[PDB]
Amino acid sequence: PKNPDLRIAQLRFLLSLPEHRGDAAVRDELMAAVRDNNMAPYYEALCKSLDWQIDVDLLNKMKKANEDELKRLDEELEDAEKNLGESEIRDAMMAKAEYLCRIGDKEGALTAFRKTYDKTVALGHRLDIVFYLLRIGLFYMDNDLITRNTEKAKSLIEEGGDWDRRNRLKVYQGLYCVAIRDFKQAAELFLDTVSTFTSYELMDYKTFVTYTVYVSMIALERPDLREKVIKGAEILEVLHSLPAVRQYLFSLYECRYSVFFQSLAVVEQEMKKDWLFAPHYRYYVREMRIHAYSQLLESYRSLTLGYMAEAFGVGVEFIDQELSRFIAAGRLHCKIDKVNEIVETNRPDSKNWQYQETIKKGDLLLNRVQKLSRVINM
């Protein structure tokens, strides 16, 4: 079954990528691996693991138990077709082909799933099969195969309302939009946090709360923050159990600038250790820095540079080198003075910066259509 199957891949992340931390992960990952009939997905994880020399009989008892379920399917296919129900061969392996999806690889999954997709004439089985293809599409990071069955999925929810098949689906598109660096779409798929449920992949609902707040704090501005995440009783009481994230969120809201970096190292360090945020923990906090800089810096014009050390975060030369790479990076709209020791600001009208992205997209699409135009007709 595929319901605990995300924790498996997250613990594969926990095995592989922390190099020093690879002992208890290969203990509990084996504790789940050489039981529940798992055969295929851990030979190269055994290569990244140690030798584990005598795994032969361990593989033999489980390819034997796998052979038992295979041969009782082979005892089912001929009794099912003698006096037929609703194609009871594909009705048996429409449920045990997910067992073959976990135990076997994606092939015996896929031919049986696209096989049984034509059996049920209503979407009450079809759309769950497509949910299963989505979930393995995450597992093998099938970034092209998810694009198919997302649209093929969404093509079924219009008949009916199917909000346990649409709001549940929005969790999949939200985890894809935070798998990629699409944060404004990730929180927008994470907009509700009401119909979202005590899930299987986030068995803590509060972990989903932490994810939607970590993406929302970038994703929306103060108006949205001073209405949306501050007045929700459904969002306040779940981080009422959180001492850290409640302080980490409110320190930016209550303008508690110096303590914000303290929990910023905590949440960023946890984000470094975390699966699925490990691609972008480096990009996250450098957005958080320039956001926290611009929020304070667009208040004053005559604010000096040696004010931010004691009130905002210590290290005057650290603020120096940190703002120099941001004005020099082309954002953080201000202009710093040095030897009279004051930071100046400016204001750009949306006439140049709004134009810059236009010449970017124009050069991008011109590269696209010129490249295609060189490809076709020799």
Binding site: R222, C255, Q295, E298, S299
Partner: protein, 53 residues
């Protein structure tokens, strides 16, 4: 129930005259808007900072 809502009404009505007297000019000193609201300068300074934030 009135004793609950008078503070939240007092914030909105604080800002309602606050946007009223800030209207007619381009620049002014904070000591005059403290004088014309007849209120202090630190709380008015932080409260004005809350508006531009």
């Amino acid at each position: 129930i009135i004793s609950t809502h008078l503070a939240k009404l007092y914030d909105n009505l604080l800002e309602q005259n606050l946007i009223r007297v800030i209207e007619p000019f381009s620049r002014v000193q904070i000591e005059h808007i403290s004088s014309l609201i007849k209120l202090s300068k630190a709380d008015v300074e932080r409260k004005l900072s809350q508006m531009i934030l």
